[PDB]
Curated annotation (Swiss-Prot):
Organism of provenance: Physeter macrocephalus
Main location: cytoplasm
PROSITE patterns attached to this UniProt entry: GLOBIN
Modified residues (Phosphothreonine): 68
Quaternary context: Monomeric.
Full protein name: Myoglobin
One annotated GO molecular function: oxygen carrier activity
Catalytic reactions of this protein: Fe(III)-heme b-[protein] + nitric oxide + H2O = Fe(II)-heme b-[protein] + nitrite + 2 H(+); H2O2 + AH2 = A + 2 H2O
Function according to Swiss-Prot or TrEMBL: Monomeric heme protein which primary function is to store oxygen and facilitate its diffusion within muscle tissues. Reversibly binds oxygen through a pentacoordinated heme iron and enables its timely and efficient release as needed during periods of heightened demand. Depending on the oxidative conditions of tissues and cells, and in addition to its ability to bind oxygen, it also has a nitrite reductase activity whereby it regulates the production of bioactive nitric oxide.
Gene: MB
Broad enzyme group: oxidoreductase
PANTHER family with a match to the protein in the record: MYOGLOBIN (PTHR47132:SF1)
Length: 154
C-alpha cells in the first residue's frame, strides 16, 4: 500500500493546481458527490435541504465547508503517508459524530478523481490518476483501521 516518491509527486503536482482555487474545486466535488450518490447529502444536517445544483453552488456555507475539507485532505497528502496525527481527529469526528461509512469515503474519493480528471488533463493523465487513487486508497485504509480502534464498523 506504500507510495513511491514519484507517485507522491504526481499527487502533489495536481494538488498544486487545486490550490489555485480550492473553493471552486470544493464546490465541483460536492456537486459531483451529491448528484452521483444523493444519500451522502443526508449526512449533512446544515446542507441536506439543498434541492438543486444551483442551490448548492449558491451556498456560501457549503463553499466554506469544501475549503475546510479539501485543505484538511491536502495537509494529509503533503505528509506523504506520515499522516497519523492528522487522521486522529478526523477519524474520531467522522466515526462518532458524523457517522460516515467507508463506502461514503469511497464515493467522495470517486468525486475527487472525476473532478480532477475533468479540470486537469495536463496534470491528471493515467499515471497521475493511478497515483492519486493509491493515495486515496491509503487514506481510506488507515481511516478504516482508526475507525475500528474507535469502535465504529464503518
Ligand atoms: C476526503 C474525505 C474527507 C475529509 C478530508 C473530510 C474533512 C472534514 C473536515 C476537516 C471537517 C470539519 C472538522 C470535523 O468535523 O472533522 C468535516 C466535517 C464534516 N464532514 Fe467530512 N471529510 C471527508 C469526507 C466526508 C464525507 C464523505 C462525508 C459525508 C458523506 C462527510 C461528512 C461530514 C460532515 C457531516 C461534517 C460536518 C459538516 C458541517 O459542519 O456542516 N465528510 N469533514
Amino acid at each position: 500500500m506504500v507510495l513511491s516518491e514519484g507517485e507522491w509527486q504526481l499527487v502533489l503536482h495536481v494538488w498544486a493546481k487545486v490550490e489555485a482555487d480550492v473553493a471552486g474545486h470544493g464546490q465541483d466535488i460536492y456537486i459531483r458527490l451529491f448528484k452521483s450518490h444523493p444519500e451522502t447529502l443526508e449526512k449533512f444536517d446544515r446542507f441536506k435541504h439543498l434541492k438543486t445544483e444551483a442551490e448548492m453552488k449558491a451556498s456560501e456555507d457549503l463553499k466554506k465547508q469544501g475549503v475546510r475539507v479539501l485543505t484538511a485532505l491536502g495537509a494529509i497528502l503533503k505528509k506523504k503517508g506520515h499522516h497519523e496525527a492528522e487522521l486522529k481527529p478526523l477519524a474520531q469526528s467522522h466515526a462518532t459524530k458524523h457517522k460516515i461509512p467507508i463506502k461514503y469515503l469511497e464515493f467522495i474519493s470517486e468525486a475527487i478523481i472525476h473532478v480532477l480528471h475533468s479540470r486537469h488533463p495536463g496534470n491528471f493523465g493515467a499515471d497521475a490518476q493511478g497515483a492519486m487513487n493509491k493515495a486515496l486508497e491509503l487514506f481510506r485504509k488507515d481511516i478504516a483501521a482508526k475507525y475500528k480502534e474507535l469502535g465504529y464498523q464503518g
